[PDB]
Short mmCIF file of C-alpha atoms and ligand atoms in Angstrom, two decimals:
data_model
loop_
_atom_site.label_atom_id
_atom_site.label_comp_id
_atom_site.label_asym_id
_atom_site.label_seq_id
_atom_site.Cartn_x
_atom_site.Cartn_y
_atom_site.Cartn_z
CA UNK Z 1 67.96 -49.70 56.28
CA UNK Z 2 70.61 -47.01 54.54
CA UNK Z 3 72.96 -47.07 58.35
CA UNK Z 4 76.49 -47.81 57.20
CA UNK Z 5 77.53 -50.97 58.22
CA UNK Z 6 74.06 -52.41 57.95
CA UNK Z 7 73.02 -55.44 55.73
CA UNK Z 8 69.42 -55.72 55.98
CA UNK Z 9 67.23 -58.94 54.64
CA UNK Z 10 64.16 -58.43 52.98
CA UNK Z 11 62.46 -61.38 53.40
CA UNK Z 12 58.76 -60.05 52.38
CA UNK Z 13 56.42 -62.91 50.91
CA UNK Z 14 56.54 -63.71 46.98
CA UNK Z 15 54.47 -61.15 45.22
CA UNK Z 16 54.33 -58.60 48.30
CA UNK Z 17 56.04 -55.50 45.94
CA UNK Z 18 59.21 -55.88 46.58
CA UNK Z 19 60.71 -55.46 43.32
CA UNK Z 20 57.63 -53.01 42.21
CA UNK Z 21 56.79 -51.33 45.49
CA UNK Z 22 60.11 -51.17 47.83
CA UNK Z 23 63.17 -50.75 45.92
CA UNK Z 24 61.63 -47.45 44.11
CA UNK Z 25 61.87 -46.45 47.87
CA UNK Z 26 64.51 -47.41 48.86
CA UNK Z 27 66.22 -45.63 45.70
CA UNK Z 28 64.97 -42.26 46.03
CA UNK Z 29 65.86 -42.84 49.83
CA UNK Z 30 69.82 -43.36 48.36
CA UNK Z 31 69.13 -40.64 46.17
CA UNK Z 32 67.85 -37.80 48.44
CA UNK Z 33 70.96 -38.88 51.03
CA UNK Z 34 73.73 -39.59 48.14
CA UNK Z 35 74.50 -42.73 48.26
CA UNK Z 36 76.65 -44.32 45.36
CA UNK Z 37 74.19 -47.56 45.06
CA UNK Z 38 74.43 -50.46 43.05
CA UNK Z 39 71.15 -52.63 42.24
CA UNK Z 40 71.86 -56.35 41.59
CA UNK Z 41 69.19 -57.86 38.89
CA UNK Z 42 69.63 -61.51 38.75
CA UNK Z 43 68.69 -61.55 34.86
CA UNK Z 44 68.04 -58.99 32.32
CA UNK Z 45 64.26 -60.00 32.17
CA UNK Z 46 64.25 -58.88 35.76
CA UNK Z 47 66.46 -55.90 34.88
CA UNK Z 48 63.64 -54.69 32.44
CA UNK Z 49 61.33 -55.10 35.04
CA UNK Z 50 63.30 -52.76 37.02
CA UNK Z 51 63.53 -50.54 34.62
CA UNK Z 52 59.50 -50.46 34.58
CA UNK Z 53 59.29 -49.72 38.40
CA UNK Z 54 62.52 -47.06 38.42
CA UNK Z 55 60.69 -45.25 35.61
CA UNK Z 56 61.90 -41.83 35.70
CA UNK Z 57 64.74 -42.20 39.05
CA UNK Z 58 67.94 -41.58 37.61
CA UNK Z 59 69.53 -44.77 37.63
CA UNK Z 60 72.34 -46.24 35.20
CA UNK Z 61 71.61 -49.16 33.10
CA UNK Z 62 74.79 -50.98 32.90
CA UNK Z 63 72.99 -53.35 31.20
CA UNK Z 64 71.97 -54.58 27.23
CA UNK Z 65 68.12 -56.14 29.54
CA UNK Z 66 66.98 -51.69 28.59
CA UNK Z 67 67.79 -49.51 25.81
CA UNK Z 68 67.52 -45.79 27.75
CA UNK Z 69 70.00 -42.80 27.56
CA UNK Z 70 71.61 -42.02 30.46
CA UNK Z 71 72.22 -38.51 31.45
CA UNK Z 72 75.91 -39.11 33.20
CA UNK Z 73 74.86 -37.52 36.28
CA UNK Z 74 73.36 -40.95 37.89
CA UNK Z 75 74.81 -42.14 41.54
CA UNK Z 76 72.43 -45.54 41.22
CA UNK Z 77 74.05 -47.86 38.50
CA UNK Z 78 72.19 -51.31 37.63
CA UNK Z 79 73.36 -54.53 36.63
CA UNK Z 80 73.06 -57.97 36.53
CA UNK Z 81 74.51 -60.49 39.38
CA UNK Z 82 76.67 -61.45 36.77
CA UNK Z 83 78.02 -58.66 35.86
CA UNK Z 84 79.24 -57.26 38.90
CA UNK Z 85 81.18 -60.07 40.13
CA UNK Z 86 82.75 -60.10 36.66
CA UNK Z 87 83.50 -56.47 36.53
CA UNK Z 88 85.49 -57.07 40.28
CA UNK Z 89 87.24 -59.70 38.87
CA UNK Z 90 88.14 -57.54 35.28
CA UNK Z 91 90.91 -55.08 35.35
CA UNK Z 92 88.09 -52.48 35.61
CA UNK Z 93 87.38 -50.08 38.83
CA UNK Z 94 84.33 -51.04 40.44
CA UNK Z 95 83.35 -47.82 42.96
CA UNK Z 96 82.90 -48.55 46.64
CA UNK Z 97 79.31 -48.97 46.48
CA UNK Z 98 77.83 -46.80 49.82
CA UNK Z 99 74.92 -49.24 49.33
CA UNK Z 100 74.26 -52.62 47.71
CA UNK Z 101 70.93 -53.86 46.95
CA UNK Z 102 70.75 -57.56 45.51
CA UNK Z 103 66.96 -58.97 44.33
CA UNK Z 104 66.43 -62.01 44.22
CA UNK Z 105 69.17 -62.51 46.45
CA UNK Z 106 68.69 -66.30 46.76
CA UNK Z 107 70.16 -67.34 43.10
CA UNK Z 108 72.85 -69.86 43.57
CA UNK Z 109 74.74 -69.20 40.75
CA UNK Z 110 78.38 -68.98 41.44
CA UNK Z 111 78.70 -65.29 40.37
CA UNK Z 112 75.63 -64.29 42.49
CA UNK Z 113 77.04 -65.71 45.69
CA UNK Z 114 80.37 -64.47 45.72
CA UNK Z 115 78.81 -61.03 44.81
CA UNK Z 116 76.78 -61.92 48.11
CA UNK Z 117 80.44 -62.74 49.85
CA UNK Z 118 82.22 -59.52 48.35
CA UNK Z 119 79.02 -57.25 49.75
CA UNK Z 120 78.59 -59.17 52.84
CA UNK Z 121 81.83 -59.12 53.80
CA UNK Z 122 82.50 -55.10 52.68
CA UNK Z 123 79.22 -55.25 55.05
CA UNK Z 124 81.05 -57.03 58.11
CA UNK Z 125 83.76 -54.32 57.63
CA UNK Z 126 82.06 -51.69 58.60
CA UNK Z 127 82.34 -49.89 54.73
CA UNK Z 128 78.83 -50.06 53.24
CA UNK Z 129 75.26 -51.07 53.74
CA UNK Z 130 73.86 -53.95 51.72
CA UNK Z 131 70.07 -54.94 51.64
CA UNK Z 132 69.22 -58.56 50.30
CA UNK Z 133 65.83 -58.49 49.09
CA UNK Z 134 64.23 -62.62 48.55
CA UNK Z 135 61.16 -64.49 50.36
CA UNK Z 136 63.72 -67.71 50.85
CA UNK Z 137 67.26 -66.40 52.36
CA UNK Z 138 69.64 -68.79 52.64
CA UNK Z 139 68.73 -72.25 55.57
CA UNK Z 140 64.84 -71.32 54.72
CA UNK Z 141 63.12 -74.25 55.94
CA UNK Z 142 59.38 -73.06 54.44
CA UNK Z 143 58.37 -74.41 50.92
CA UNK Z 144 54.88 -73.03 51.43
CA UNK Z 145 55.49 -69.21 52.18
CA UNK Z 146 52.33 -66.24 52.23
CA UNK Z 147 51.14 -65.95 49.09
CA UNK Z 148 48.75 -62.50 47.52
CA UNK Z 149 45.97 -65.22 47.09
CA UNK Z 150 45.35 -69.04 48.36
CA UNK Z 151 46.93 -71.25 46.50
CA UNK Z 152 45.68 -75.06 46.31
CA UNK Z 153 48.74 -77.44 47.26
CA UNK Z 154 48.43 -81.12 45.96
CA UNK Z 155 50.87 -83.53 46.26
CA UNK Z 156 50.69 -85.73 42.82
CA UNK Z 157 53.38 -87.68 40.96
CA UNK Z 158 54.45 -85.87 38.26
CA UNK Z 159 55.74 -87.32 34.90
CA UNK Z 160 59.56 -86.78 34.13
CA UNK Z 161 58.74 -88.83 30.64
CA UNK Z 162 56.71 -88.61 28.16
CA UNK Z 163 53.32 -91.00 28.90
CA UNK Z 164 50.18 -92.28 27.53
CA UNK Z 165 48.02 -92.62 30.50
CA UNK Z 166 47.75 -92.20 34.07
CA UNK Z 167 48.38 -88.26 34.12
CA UNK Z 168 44.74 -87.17 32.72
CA UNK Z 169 44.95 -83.68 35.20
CA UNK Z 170 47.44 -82.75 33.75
CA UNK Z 171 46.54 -82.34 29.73
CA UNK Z 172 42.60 -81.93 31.11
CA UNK Z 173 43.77 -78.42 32.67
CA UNK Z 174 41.92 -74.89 30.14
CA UNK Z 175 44.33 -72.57 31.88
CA UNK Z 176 48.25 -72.06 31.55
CA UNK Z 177 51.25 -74.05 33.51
CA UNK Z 178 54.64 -73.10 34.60
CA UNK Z 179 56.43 -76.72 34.61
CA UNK Z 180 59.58 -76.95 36.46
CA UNK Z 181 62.07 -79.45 35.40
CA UNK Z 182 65.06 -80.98 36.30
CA UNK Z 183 67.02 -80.46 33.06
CA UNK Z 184 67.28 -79.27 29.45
CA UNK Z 185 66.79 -83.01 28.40
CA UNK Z 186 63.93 -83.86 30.87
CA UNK Z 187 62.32 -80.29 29.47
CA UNK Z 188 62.51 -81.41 25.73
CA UNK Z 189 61.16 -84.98 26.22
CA UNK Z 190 57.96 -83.54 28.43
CA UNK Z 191 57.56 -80.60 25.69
CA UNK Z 192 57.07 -82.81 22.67
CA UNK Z 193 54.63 -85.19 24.88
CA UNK Z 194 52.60 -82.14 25.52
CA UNK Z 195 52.88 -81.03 21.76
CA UNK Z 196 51.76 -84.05 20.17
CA UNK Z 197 48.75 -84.04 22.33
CA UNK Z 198 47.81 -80.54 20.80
CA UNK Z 199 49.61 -78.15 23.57
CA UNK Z 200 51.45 -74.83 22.88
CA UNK Z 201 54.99 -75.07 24.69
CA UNK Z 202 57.28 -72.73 25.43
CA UNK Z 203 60.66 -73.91 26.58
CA UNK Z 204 62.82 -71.90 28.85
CA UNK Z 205 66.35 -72.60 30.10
CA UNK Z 206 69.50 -70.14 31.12
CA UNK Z 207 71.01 -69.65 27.93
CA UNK Z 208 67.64 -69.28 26.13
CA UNK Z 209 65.81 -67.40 29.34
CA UNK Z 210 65.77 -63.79 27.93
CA UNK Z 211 65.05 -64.50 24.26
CA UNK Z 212 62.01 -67.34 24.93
CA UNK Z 213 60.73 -65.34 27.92
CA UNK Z 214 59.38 -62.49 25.56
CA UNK Z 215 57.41 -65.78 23.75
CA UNK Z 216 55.18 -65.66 27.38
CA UNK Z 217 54.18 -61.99 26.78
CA UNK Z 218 53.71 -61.79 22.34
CA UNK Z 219 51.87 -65.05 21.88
CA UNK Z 220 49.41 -67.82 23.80
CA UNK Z 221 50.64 -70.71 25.46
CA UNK Z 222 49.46 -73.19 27.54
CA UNK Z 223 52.71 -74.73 29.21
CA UNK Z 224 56.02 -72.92 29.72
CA UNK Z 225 58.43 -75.87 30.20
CA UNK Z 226 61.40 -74.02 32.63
CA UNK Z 227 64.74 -75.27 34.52
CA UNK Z 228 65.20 -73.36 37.55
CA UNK Z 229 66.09 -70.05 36.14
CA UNK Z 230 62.20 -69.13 36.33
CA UNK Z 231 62.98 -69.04 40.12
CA UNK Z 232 64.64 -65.94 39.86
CA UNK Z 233 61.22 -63.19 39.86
CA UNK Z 234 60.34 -64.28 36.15
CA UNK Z 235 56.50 -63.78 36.19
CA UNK Z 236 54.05 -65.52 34.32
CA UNK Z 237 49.88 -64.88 33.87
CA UNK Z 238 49.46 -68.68 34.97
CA UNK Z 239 47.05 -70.60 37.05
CA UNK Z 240 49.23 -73.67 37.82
CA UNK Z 241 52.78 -74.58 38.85
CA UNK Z 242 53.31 -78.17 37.97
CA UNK Z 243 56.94 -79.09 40.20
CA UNK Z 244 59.19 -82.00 39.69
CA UNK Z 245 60.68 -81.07 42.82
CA UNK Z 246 64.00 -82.31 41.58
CA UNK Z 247 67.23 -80.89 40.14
CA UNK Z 248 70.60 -81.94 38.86
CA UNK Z 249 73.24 -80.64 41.37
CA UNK Z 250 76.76 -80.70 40.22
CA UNK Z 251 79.57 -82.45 42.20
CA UNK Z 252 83.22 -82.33 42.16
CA UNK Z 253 84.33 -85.70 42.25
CA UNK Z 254 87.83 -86.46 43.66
CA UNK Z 255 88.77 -82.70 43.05
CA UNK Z 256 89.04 -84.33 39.57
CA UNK Z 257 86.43 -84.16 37.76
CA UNK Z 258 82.06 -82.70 37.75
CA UNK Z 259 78.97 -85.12 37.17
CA UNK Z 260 75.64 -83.72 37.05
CA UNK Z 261 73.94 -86.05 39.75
CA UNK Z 262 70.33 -86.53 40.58
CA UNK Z 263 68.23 -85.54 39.60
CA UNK Z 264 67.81 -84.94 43.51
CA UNK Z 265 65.36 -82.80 45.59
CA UNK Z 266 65.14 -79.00 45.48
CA UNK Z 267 65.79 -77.30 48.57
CA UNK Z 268 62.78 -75.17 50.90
CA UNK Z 269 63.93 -72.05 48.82
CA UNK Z 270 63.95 -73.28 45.01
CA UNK Z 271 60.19 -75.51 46.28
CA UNK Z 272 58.66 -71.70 47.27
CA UNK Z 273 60.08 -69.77 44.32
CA UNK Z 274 58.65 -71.92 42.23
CA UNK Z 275 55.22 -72.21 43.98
CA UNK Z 276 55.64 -68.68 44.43
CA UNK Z 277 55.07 -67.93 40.04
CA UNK Z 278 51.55 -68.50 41.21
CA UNK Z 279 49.13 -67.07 43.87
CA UNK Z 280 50.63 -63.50 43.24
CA UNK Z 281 46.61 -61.86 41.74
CA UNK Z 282 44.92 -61.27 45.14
CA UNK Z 283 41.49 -61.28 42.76
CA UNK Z 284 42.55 -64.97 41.50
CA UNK Z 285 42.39 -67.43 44.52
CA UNK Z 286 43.20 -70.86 43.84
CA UNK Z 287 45.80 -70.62 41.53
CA UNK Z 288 47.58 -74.64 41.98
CA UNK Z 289 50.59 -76.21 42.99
CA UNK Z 290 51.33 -79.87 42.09
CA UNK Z 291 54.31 -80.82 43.39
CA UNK Z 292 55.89 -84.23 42.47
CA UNK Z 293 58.59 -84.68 45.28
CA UNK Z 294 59.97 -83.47 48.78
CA UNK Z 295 62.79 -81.10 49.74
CA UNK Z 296 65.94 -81.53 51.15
CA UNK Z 297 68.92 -79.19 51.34
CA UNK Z 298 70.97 -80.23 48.31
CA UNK Z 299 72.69 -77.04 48.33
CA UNK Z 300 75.65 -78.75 50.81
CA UNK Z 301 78.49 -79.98 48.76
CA UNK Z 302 76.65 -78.71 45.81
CA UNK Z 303 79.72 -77.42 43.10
CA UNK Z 304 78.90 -73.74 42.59
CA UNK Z 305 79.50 -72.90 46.53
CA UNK Z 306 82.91 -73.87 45.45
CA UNK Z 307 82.87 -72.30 42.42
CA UNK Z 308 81.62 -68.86 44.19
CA UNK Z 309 85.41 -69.31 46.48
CA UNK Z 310 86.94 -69.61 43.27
CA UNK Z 311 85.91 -66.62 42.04
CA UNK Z 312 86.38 -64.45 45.44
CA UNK Z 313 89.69 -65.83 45.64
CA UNK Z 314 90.87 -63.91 42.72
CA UNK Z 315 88.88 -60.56 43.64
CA UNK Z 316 90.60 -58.32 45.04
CA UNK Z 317 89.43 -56.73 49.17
CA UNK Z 318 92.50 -55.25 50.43
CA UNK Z 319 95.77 -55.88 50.24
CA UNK Z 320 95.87 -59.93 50.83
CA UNK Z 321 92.33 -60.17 52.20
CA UNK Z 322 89.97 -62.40 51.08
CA UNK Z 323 86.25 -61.92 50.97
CA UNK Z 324 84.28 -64.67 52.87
CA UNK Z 325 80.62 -66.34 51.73
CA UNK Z 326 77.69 -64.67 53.10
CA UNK Z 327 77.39 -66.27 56.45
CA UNK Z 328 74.08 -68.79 55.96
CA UNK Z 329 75.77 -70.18 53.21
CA UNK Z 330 79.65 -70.43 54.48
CA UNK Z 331 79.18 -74.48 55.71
CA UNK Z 332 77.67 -75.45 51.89
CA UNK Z 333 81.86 -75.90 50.70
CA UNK Z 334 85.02 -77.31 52.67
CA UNK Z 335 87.05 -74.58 51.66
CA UNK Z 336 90.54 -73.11 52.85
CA UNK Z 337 89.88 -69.08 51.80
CA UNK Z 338 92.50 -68.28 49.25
CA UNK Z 339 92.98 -71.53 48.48
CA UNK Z 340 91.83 -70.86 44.42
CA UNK Z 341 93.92 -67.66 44.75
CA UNK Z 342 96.11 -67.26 41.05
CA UNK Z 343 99.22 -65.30 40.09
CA UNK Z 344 98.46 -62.16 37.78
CA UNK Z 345 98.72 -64.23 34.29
CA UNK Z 346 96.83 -67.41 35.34
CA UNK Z 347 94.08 -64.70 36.62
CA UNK Z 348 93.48 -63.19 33.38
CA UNK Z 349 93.54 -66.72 32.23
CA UNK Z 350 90.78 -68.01 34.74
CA UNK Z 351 88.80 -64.64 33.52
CA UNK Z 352 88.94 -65.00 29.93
CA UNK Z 353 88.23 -68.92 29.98
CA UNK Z 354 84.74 -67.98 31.55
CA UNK Z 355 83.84 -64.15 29.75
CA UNK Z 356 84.76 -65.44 26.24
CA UNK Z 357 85.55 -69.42 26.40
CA UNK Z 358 81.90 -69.37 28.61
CA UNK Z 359 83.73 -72.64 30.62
CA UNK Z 360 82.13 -73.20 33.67
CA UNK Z 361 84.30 -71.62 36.59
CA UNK Z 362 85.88 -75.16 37.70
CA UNK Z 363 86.93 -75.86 34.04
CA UNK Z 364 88.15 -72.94 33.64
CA UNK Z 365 90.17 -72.87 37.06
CA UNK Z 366 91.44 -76.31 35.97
CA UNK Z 367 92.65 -74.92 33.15
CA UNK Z 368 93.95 -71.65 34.48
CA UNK Z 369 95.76 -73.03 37.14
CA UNK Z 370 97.55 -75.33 34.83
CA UNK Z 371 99.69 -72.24 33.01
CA UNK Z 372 97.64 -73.22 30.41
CA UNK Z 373 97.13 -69.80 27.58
CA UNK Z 374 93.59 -68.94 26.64
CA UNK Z 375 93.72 -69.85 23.10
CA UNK Z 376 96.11 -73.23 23.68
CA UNK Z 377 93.67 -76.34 23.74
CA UNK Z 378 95.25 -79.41 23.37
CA UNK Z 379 94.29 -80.09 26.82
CA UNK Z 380 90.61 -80.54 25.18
CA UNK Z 381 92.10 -83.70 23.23
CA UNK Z 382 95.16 -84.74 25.66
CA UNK Z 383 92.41 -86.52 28.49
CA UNK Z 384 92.45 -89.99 29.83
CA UNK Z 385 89.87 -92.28 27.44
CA UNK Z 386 87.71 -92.24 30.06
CA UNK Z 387 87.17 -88.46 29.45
CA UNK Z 388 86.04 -89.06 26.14
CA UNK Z 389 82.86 -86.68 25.47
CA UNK Z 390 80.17 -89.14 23.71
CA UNK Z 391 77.46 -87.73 20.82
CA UNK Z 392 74.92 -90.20 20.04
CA UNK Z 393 76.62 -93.01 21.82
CA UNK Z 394 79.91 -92.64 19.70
CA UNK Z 395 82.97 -90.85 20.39
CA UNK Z 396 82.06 -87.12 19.53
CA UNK Z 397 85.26 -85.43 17.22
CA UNK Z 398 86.10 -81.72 16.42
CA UNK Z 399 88.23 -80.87 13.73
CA UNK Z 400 91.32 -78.90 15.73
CA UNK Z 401 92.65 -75.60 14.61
CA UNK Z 402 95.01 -77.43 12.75
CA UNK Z 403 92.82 -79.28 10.74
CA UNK Z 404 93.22 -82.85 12.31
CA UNK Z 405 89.83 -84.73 13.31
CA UNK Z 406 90.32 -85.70 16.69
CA UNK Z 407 87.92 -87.25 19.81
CA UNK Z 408 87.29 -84.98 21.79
CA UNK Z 409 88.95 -86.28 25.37
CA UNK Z 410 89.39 -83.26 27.84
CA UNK Z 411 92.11 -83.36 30.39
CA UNK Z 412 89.70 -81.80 32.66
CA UNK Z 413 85.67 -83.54 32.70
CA UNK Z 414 83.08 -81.34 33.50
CA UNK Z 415 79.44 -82.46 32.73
CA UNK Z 416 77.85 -79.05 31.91
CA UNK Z 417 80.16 -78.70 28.78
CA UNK Z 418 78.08 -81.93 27.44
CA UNK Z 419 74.77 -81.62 29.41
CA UNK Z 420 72.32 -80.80 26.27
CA UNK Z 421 73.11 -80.57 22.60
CA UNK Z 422 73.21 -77.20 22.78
CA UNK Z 423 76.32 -77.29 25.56
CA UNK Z 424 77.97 -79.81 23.46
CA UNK Z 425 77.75 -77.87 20.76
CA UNK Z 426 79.66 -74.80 22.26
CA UNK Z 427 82.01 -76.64 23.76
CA UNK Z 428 83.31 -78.23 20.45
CA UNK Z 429 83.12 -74.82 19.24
CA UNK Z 430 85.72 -73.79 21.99
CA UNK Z 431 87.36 -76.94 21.36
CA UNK Z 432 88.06 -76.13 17.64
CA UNK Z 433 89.93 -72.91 18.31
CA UNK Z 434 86.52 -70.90 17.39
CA UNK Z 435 86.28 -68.81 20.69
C1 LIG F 1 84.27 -95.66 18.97
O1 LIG F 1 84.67 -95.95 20.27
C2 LIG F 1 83.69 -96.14 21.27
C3 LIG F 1 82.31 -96.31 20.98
C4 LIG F 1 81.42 -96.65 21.99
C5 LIG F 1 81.94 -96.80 23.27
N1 LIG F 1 81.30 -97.17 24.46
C6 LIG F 1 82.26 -97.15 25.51
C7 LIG F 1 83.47 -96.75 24.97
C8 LIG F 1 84.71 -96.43 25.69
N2 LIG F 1 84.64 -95.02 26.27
C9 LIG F 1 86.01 -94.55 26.63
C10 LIG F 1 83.95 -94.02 25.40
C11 LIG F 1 83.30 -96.57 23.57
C12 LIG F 1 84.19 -96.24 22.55
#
């Protein structure tokens, strides 16, 4: 796998050791031929895991997932997706990797696939070897992949609302569920349904995942409620999946403006991640999978394959190259390469309106692209009246950083500023100057 100008997919089965097994290999493979290697975690929880299974390689933690001292004389540095697609973008030298290694290398997050653009394409180029270790790579067609035991597949409908009848199996269950949701909203309303009927829930989402996840391990449960971060090689000790088979996909509108639509099918990949939480204890056959829906690839035209150009637009290659997407996912955008592509200041701009102002990357491109300054936002009051962000069915306001109550009204819409209270609540924080 460690040939230069190789990029290899590991497409071994959920549960088959990848993580645990075959990247402790594969690192003391790098090791013993020195290669400067970067391992891609797709979230700290998995990063910790890592950690666990690198015990005692020398390997960098560029990461706050493990607290270990590093000796300075590591060649392997790890880090999050994330973080390695913002560190190309940041005024900070990123080495020339010999050899990139990205688990769980189907997460769709923008960040994660243009890190799979910058590799693949340094890849195509003949200057380093990449290996891409996930059971679903990109066009997977398979919702039902090998499993470590048999797992019993039912489809059932499956509530999206809290109910008072009709659902018996799923309260009647003695063991613990992984429920996968469409949304922060859908999660809450399902959560206290299955609280007031005496379960013990634990609700995961992204900016919650690392925090609630340790909840799974310290205490007992009998649901954890998830959006589809869990996808990304978070395990659980459970004995059913319960799947909504949907998700909200976010769509530019007009070049204008993002709605959260759907909720919509899941594509092959998300439907055998999250079948694939269960099934992994070869002594525990029939684990189940009740899954409430069919797939369909609503990756194409979905916004973060756009977002992901965005962001390899404004990392530098060489000279005025431009990294493409990873091949299997190149027809998922319409998009000109170097299209997104900003002068110095609106760069830093675009940068700091998603490390700090944590705007998603269209908002902040919007934004950026205007030659509007980080800290100036009257453009979060300055929107059409159509634009007006609603709390509770009225108007929501922010006092500005001058002190005036206003509505807030945002030149720019995007639906994930406003998608839970919690998203809301930042965002009027940013608003108000507080950011
Ligand atoms: C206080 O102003 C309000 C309250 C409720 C409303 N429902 C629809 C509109 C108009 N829209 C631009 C928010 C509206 C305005």
């Amino acid at each position: 796998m460690l040939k230069k100008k190789q990029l290899t997919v590991l497409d071994l089965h959920p549960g088959a050791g990848k993580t645990r097994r075959v990247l402790p290999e594969i690192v003391r493979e790098a090791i013993k031929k020195r290669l400067r290697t970067v391992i891609l975690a797709p979230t700290r929880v998995v990063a910790a895991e890592m950690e666990e299974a690198l015990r005692g390689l020398p390997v960098r933690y560029m990461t706050t997932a493990v607290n270990v001292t590093h000796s300075g004389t590591e060649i392997v540095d790890l880090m999050c997706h994330a973080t390695f697609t913002s560190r190309l973008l940041q005024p900070i030298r990123v080495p020339n990797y010999n050899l990139n290694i990205m688990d769980e290398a189907h997460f769709t997050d923008p960040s994660s696939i243009a890190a799979r653009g910058y590799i693949s394409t340094r890849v195509e180029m003949g200057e380093a070897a990449a290996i891409f270790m996930t059971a679903t790579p990109p066009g997977t067609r398979d919702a039902f992949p090998d499993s470590n035991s048999p797992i019993m597949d039912t489809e059932v409908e499956v509530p999206e609302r809290a109910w008072s009848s009709g659902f018996d199996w799923v309260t009647d269950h003695s063991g613990k569920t992984v429920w996968f949701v469409p949304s922060v909203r859908n999660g809450n309303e399902i959560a206290a349904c299955l609280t007031k009927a005496g379960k013990r829930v634990i609700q995961l989402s992204r900016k919650t995942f690392e925090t609630e996840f340790q909840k799974t391990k310290n205490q007992e449960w009998d649901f954890v409620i998830t959006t589809d971060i869990s996808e990304m090689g978070a395990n659980f000790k459970a004995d059913r999946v319960i799947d909504s088979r949907r998700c909200l996909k976010p769509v530019i509108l007009d070049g204008e403006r993002v709605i959260l639509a759907g909720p919509m099918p899941v594509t092959h990949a998300s439907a055998a991640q999250r079948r694939g939480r269960i099934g992994r204890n070869p002594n525990k056959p029939g684990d189940e999978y009740m899954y409430g829906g069919g797939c369909a690839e609503t990756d194409e035209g979905h916004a973060h394959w756009l977002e992901a150009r965005m962001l390899l637009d404004n990392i530098y290659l060489q000279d005025g190259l431009i990294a493409s997407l990873y091949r299997p996912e190149a027809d998922k955008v319409a998009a000109i390469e170097g299209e997104f592509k900003l002068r110095t200041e609106q760069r830093k701009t675009f940068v700091e309106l998603m490390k700090r102002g944590d705007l998603p990357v269209w908002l902040a491109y919007q934004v950026a692209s205007a030659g509007i300054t980080y800290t100036d936002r009257r453009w979060c009051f300055d929107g059409t009246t159509n634009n007006t962000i609603m709390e509770d069915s009225v108007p929501a306001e922010v006092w500005t950083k001058y002190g005036e109550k206003r509505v807030l009204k945002p030149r720019w819409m995007d639906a994930r500023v406003c998608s839970d209270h919690a998203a809301l609540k930042s965002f009027k924080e940013f608003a108000a100057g507080k950011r």
